[PDB]
Amino acid sequence: SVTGSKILRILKAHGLAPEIPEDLYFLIKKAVAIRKHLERNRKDKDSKFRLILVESRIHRLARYYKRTKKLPPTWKYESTTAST
Amino acid sequence: KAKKSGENINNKLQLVMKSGKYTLGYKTVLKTLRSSKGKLIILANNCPPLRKSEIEYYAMLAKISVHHFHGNNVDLGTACGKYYRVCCLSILDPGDSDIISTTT
Amino acid sequence: IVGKYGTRYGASLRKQIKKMEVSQHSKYFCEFCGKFAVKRKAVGIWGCKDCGKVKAGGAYTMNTASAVTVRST
RNA sequence: GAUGAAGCGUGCCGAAAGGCACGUGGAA
RNA sequence: AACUCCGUGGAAGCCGUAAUGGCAGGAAGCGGA
RNA sequence: UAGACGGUGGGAGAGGGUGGUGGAAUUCCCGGAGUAGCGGUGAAAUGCGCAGAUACCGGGAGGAACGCCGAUGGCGAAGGCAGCCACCUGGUCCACCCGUG
């Protein structure tokens, strides 16, 4: 079949964007574009609520990671500008 | 005709940040041009007036390809607490990438 | 802000002086380059300390609601 | 000589928003 | 001396002030007008 | 991996924000033609009209709303949201069961 060596060959070329904590980064991309949307459109309160909840979820993932590792919640707490 | 493209730019230069030759900054770029070492010049959209015309002449005199983007930060991270910004980049180096090929 | 006025002049007068002047003194994004280094040089006169670009703008804001409509039309 | 506004800094807090303290600054 | 400027140099957090501030559109340093 | 989240692919919508724009109607103004009333009510009167109103045709200006479709319908967390166009943007459903665990 298709063996692990030749698989990682393919991974290294394209380094691998196929999926996953991804979760955090994807939501950063959501947040960023939503923030820019709401830089205009200051009157869109409803989607602004969705921003608040995006930012919240991001933090909870970061805190999750930080906790369930002492290494990743380092970066996460900082990049979220979360905590204090 | 596609779904977002969009920003295959962003992820394209995203790699360069870890992969590697290349030089950032106006002066160093203008230098690369005059030295004729640069291969390509990427300019940010906003980029100051006459500040862009400079890079343009010397890009012309040096026969350097100019790919109009630009520049910025890993926006998502530095956004939060993070960019530095870049108004131009000079491909004296792309490595495991290919932005040089059919794209400007 | 309006604190220089002490207990004089009343609420509206100084609330608006502070409002106008806060906006007034905010970082403003230069039209030529894109840097946030535009400062009022005289009401309606604006300049970027970065590249020196001297612009005509509103009296207390570099851009007015009407000057924006122009760009479109 | 006194009081000490905006602005700015540092620290802490918050996902952000901002908030608090201390300092700086000196307005009228 | 300060200010301005030239060369060099190549900082992606560092330089600087009483304070504001400065920087890859190149900071400090070194050398000059 | 049975919750949750993500991926790829299908979808509906008066969800929100900015700019634009279409036609109907009202008011006013201009021109034309045209007289003695118009309006309004249970009846009336005030009112407007011979400096020519009302009814009619054409031209213009301006503001506000968006007929039919329209539902017993749809969207949103609620308040609430309906002419058309583009841009920016939120939520949400379904299929595959692919990823995190």
Please report the domains of chain B, with CATH numbers, ordered by start residue: 8-90 (3.30.1330.30)
Q: Tokens representing C34?
A: 């894109």
Separation between Cα atoms, residue C51 and residue B48, nearest integer Å: 9
Instruction: Report DSSP letters for A44-70, one per residue.
Output: --HHHHHHHHHHHHHHHHHHHHHHS-S
Q: Evaluate whether A38 touches A49 at the Cβ level (below 8 Å).
A: no
Q: Evaluate whether C60 touches C24 at the Cβ level (below 8 Å).
A: yes
A12 located within any domain:
no
Q: Tokens representing A74?
A: 């380092």
Between the CA of A82 and the C1' of D22, what is the distance in angstroms?
Answer: 23
How far the first Cα of chain B sits from its last, in Å, is 19
Separation between Cα atoms, residue C50 and residue B43, nearest integer Å: 19
The DSSP bridge partners found for residue B42 are B67, B89
Q: List own/partner pairs for A21-25 with CB under 8 A and 24 or more apart.
A: A21/A61, A21/A65, A21/A72, A23/A61, A24/A58, A24/A61, A24/A62, A24/A65, A24/A76, A25/B76
Q: Evaluate whether B95 touches B20 at the Cβ level (below 8 Å).
A: yes
A4 located within any domain:
no
Neighbours of B51 (CB within 10 A): 16
Separation between Cα atoms, residue B28 and residue B25, nearest integer Å: 6
Separation between Cα atoms, residue A21 and residue B70, nearest integer Å: 28
Between the CA of A39 and the C1' of F74, what is the distance in angstroms?
Answer: 29
The CATH number of the domain holding residue A47 is 1.10.287.10
Q: Evaluate whether B13 touches B88 at the Cβ level (below 8 Å).
A: no
Which residue of chain B is at minimal alpha-carbon distance from A12? B96
Half-sphere exposure of B85 (CA within 13 A, CB side): 10
Nearest to B101 by CA among B53, B67, B63, B61: B67
Neighbours of A18 (CB within 10 A): 7
By Cβ distance, the residue of B11, B80, B96 closest to A81 is B80
- Strand D: which positions are within 7 A of a protein CB? 5-7, 12-17, 27-28
Which residue of chain A is at minimal alpha-carbon distance from B10? A29
Structural domain count of chain A? 1
Domains along chain C with CATH numbers? 2-72 (2.20.25.30)
Neighbours of A66 (CB within 10 A): 20
Separation between Cα atoms, residue A76 and residue A52, nearest integer Å: 18
A71 located within any domain:
yes
Between the CA of C67 and the C1' of F83, what is the distance in angstroms?
Answer: 29
A60 located within any domain:
yes
- Any idea which residue has 């909840």 for tokens? A53
- Owning domain of residue A43: 19-79
Please give the DSSP secondary-structure letter assigned to residue C27: -
Determine the distance in angstroms separating the CA of B81 from the nearest CA of chain A, rounded to an integer.
6
Angle at A57 between CA A73 and CA B16, to 5 degrees: 60
- Strand F: which positions are within 7 A of a protein CB? 5-7, 9, 15-20, 76-79, 88-91, 98-100
Separation between Cα atoms, residue C58 and residue A79, nearest integer Å: 38
Separation between Cα atoms, residue C53 and residue C46, nearest integer Å: 8
Q: Given its phi and psi angles, is residue C7 left (phi above 0), alpha (psi -120 to 50 degrees) or beta? A: alpha
Q: Does A68 touch chain B (CB under 8 A)?
A: no
Instruction: Report DSSP letters for chain B, one per residue.
Output: -------HHHHHHHHHTT----EESHHHHHHHHHHT---EEEE-SS--TTHHHHHHHHHHHTT-EEEE------HHHHHHH-PPP-SEEE-S---S--TTTT--
Determine the distance in angstroms separating the CA of A1 from the nearest CA of chain B, rounded to an integer.
28
For residue B47, list chain C residues with Cβ-Cβ distance below 8 A.
Answer: 33-34
- Any idea which residue has 């409803």 for tokens? A46
- Counting Cβ atoms within 10 Å, is residue B74 exposed (0-12), middle (13-18) or buried (19+)? middle
Separation between Cα atoms, residue A57 and residue A47, nearest integer Å: 15
Q: Evaluate whether C49 touches C59 at the Cβ level (below 8 Å).
A: no
Separation between Cα atoms, residue B72 and residue B43, nearest integer Å: 11
Q: Write the CB contacts of A9 (distance below 8 Å, at least 6 apart in sequence).
A: none
The DSSP bridge partners found for residue C39 are C47
Separation between Cα atoms, residue A47 and residue A56, nearest integer Å: 14
Question: Is the C-beta atom of A79 closer than 7 angstroms to strand D?
Answer: no
